[PDB]
Structures are given as structure tokens and as C-alpha cells.
């Protein structure tokens, strides 16, 4: 099973200038809980944005060019990325925009955080078709001293 996890600001913005400009510790904690002990697939730009391997996860990087760091696994195609994960119950695709586009048709589950923030951005989450997806979990949180925007954790499963 392939799942996508992402945090979306208004208008599906996910990034600007190879960064995420907001800071929502509660959402990073949610990201860690839902990805720990699973393989994570990311594109090369997202690897450069994170800047280090994510501990406790098999890190698989998509790039058309040879890898430059043996602490992670480098692959050259979507099919190779999937194969490099082995026989696991759940593969997590962690972006960015161009990677999410390619894996969306193959995904059974989306873990989405909707952030009440307006962000100028240059990268968006793919338009998906709402009729294809059932919301099975949602949890709203107001802003607090640690998280400066309200946010909504949602899990959707392909119908
Ligand atoms: N809010 C969130 O949830 C979230 C999550 C992740 C990322 N982001 C943001 O998203 C932005 C980065 O997204 P992006 O769309 O620019 O880039 P990306 O999807 O992270 O990376 C694109 C790169 O991945 C490689 N790639 C993708 N598909 C491939 C394929 N089929 N075969 C081989 N290589 C492939 C290519 O690398 P080469 O050029 O080396 O061939 C391509 O240039 C940043 O702003 C980041 O902060 C946000
Ligand atoms: N919901 C969601 N939020 C995100 O921030 C997110 N980020 C990415 C890609 N970028 C990043 C950037 C930083 C870290 C990071 O530092 N993660 C630590 C945080 C642990 C914690 O704060 O509790 C990790 O171990 O996962 C992960 C992914 C992909 N999907 C996402 N999905
Ligand atoms: Mn092929
Ligand atoms: Mn197999
Ligand atoms: Mn806000």
C-alpha cells in the first residue's frame, strides 16, 4: 500500500523557494508518528530541503542523477523506488510536488494536514478528485502558544 503525507496551506501551497516557511511543531510530531519505522520516498529537492536523513526510516531518494550520499538509497524511477521498499505494509511518499503528482494515482491513503495560513508559494499539492476519496479521520486544533495557526489532521482513503 502506498500513502502520501503532506501539509497544505491555503490553495494547496506546500512550499516556497525549496522551504516550508511556517513552523507547526504539532504537525511535525504527527509526521514523525505516521512515518516512523516505514520507508519514505522523496524527490531530490525535498531531500535537499530536509538536509539530513530522517532517523528510524528507510530514506529513498528519487533522482535521475547518481546519488551523492550513501546514508540513503538512491533510485532512478518510480518502479525502482517502490521495489527498493521491499515487502512492507505501508510505503510513505513525503513529496515534493512533482513526486506527489506521480504517486497520487497509485495511492490508497492520504494523510493531509490543512493549515489555516496564507502562504505565497511556488509548489502545490496535486489537484485530486474529491469524489475518489473518503474521509475516515479528522481532528481540528486551534492555534496555541506553540502552533501559530489552526490546523486539521485528515486521513482519506480511496473509495
Ligand atoms: N508541505 C509539505 O508537505 C511538503 C512536503 C514535501 C516537500 N515540500 C516542499 O516541496 C518543494 C519541493 O518540491 P518539488 O516539486 O520542487 O521537488 P521534488 O518533488 O521534491 O523533487 C523533484 C526531483 O526529484 C527527482 N524526481 C522526481 N521524479 C522522478 C522520477 N520519476 N525519476 C527520477 N527522478 C525523479 C528529480 O531529481 P533530479 O533533478 O535530480 O533528476 C526532480 O527534479 C519544497 O518547497 C519543499 O519544501 C513540502
Ligand atoms: N504533515 C506534514 N508535515 C510536514 O512538515 C511534512 N514535511 C515533509 C517534508 N519535510 C520535512 C521537514 C522536516 C522534517 C522533520 O524534521 N521531521 C522530524 C520531526 C520530529 C518532530 O518534530 O517531532 C522527524 O523525525 O520526522 C520532516 C519532513 C513531508 N510531509 C510532511 N507532512
Ligand atoms: Mn522503468
Ligand atoms: Mn514483493
Ligand atoms: Mn493563520
Swiss-Prot record:
Keywords assigned by UniProt, alphabetized: Antibiotic resistance, Methotrexate resistance, NADP, One-carbon metabolism, Oxidoreductase, Trimethoprim resistance
Positions of the DHFR domain: 1-158
GO biological process entries: 10-formyltetrahydrofolate biosynthetic process; dihydrofolate metabolic process; folic acid biosynthetic process; folic acid metabolic process; one-carbon metabolic process; response to antibiotic; response to methotrexate; response to xenobiotic stimulus
SUPFAM superfamilies: Dihydrofolate reductase-like (SSF53597)
Outcome, altering residue 92 to F: No effect. Increases catalytic rate about 7-fold
Taxonomy, superkingdom: Bacteria
PROSITE patterns, sorted: DHFR_1 (PS00075), DHFR_2 (PS51330)
GO CC list: cytosol
Catalyzed reaction equations: (6S)-5,6,7,8-tetrahydrofolate + NADP(+) = 7,8-dihydrofolate + NADPH + H(+)
UniProt-annotated binding residues for substrate: 5, 27, 52, 57, 113
Alphabetized GO MF terms: dihydrofolate reductase activity; dihydrofolic acid binding; folic acid binding; methotrexate binding; NADP binding; NADP+ binding; NADPH binding
Any Pfam family hit: DHFR_1
Recorded consequence of changing residue 42 to V: Increases catalytic rate almost 2-fold
EC number: 1.5.1.3
InterPro entries: DHFR, DHFR-like_dom_sf, DHFR_CS, DHFR_dom
Pathway(s) per entry: Cofactor biosynthesis; tetrahydrofolate biosynthesis; 5,6,7,8-tetrahydrofolate from 7,8-dihydrofolate: step 1/1
Effect of residue 16 to N: Increases catalytic rate about 2-fold. Increases catalytic rate about 7-fold
Entry similarity comment: Belongs to the dihydrofolate reductase family.
Function (record text): Key enzyme in folate metabolism. Catalyzes an essential reaction for de novo glycine and purine synthesis, and for DNA precursor synthesis.
Remarks, miscellaneous: The strain K12 sequence is shown. Strain B [RT500] is resistant to 500 micrograms per milliliter of trimethoprim.
NCBIfam families: PRK10769.1
Record-given protein name: Dihydrofolate reductase
